[PDB]
Scaffold this active site. Sequence first.
Site: not given
Lengths: 283, 283
Positions: B130, B223, B253
């Site tokens: 991320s 996501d 995610h």
Amino acid sequence: ASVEEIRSLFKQFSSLTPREEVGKIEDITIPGSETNIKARVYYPKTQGPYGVLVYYHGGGFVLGDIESYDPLCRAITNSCQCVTISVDYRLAPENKFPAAVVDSFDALKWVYNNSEKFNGKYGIAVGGDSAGGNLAAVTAILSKKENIKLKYQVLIYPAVSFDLITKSLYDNGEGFFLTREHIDWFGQQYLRSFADLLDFRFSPILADLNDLPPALIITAEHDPLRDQGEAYANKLLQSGVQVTSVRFNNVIHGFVSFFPFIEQGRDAIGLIGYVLRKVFYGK
Amino acid sequence: ASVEEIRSLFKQFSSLTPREEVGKIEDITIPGSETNIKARVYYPKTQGPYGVLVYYHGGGFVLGDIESYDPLCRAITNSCQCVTISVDYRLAPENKFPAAVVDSFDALKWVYNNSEKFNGKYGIAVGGDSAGGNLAAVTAILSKKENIKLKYQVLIYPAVSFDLITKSLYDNGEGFFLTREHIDWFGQQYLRSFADLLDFRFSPILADLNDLPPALIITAEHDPLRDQGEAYANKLLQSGVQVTSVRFNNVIHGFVSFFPFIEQGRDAIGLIGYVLRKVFYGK
């Protein structure tokens, strides 16, 4: 070119692909219900006992065979560190549906019943690419019905349904190696009659998918079969089965067979080896 | 929910997670250009020499830390059989952009120049999830500018651009854990001014991606960051870099952080371990 000419071509193409060393190879004959089924057993270089993967080659039910798939089965054997048994199921148009399925299931049953021959104490999995993924999926469904207990199923860009509707079929139906025309032609060679479209042994998406073995399902971004493969994963999940569904982007149908020069194919084989080492050995 | 609170709750959640044994663990303090940087060094159970993965946790530049990521970094260590160095880069809003980047790059540069402390003869890779994938991507770009020769970059659902336009932002921007609102709020904590939107160190998609190390890029079907992650893979490819871009389907995610209960997460860690064993060890 004739169908025989193309079958031969694929064997020839194989011989240009480097064959990894494994531990030991032997050819066996499996006594089938309709035929005697040739198989090739690959042992890895590690010590037993082992898990055993029964592998069904792809080729549209018409093409492919133990020899043309030999380099890929070697690579899988070394990746998974498991015994791999590559099955020479009867091909169409000479042998229509359901011969491939009969041979594939007969072979699995026999391997399950004889796994001690291979020091196969850690259990049995099925796996296959394209038409072979179809066979692996259908064999797993047939096993549940016969209370044969499989560890895992590896479905590599499988065909799971007759398809005239998926977006991927139209988006990817031309220019990416496997075309609509090919798909239609393979389907014509394999099918006996229209009624076979109702048969879960042809379209396994039709079956009750409860209580199947957990699955790795690999699809390819540019494959006409991509959406239906991902649908099979969703239906497994809806039925309470663990499935890791992974779409390899930027690659076409068949990319795993091309592992020597498409690196994403090598990495897919690495993932296959991981999930099977996980399920068989706890790592 | 203040920043401090929400940090500390994530710290708790992570505390109840079971931790895989590794070979051994050393906490070190790297002398950064702007700060002293804490890092935890995980050794695998195999003996060396090793490859080294320098790892940057996610959490939107605001959350996460070494302790809350300890379970994941242990799992990765055992999977890659490599030394993993988890970096405690400075967090926002206390430390605005480019603090996290300066610390991430200073850490990499020091590990690179001191690889013998780690018996890291097989070379250095970067990775992160991320925000941490953003940092690993940016760290690779900065390395190339300074002739630091990395082996590999592992980008786990990375944020690679300011985004108001991708389809997945809108399709997946509510109801899948990581929301529009969160992405906004993280950006507002992290950036100094609108000018920083021009900075490749915030949006690495802006950079010239020629000659970067080969990449594994994992995205997640549901996501909001999915499309931009796959865009980064495509731009790498266009730029002559080898990348295996894999979309894990049916997951949201963060799924890799929840590996103990999302099996696809565990399988992602297996794939990460395969690609790094391949590049470091030829495995």
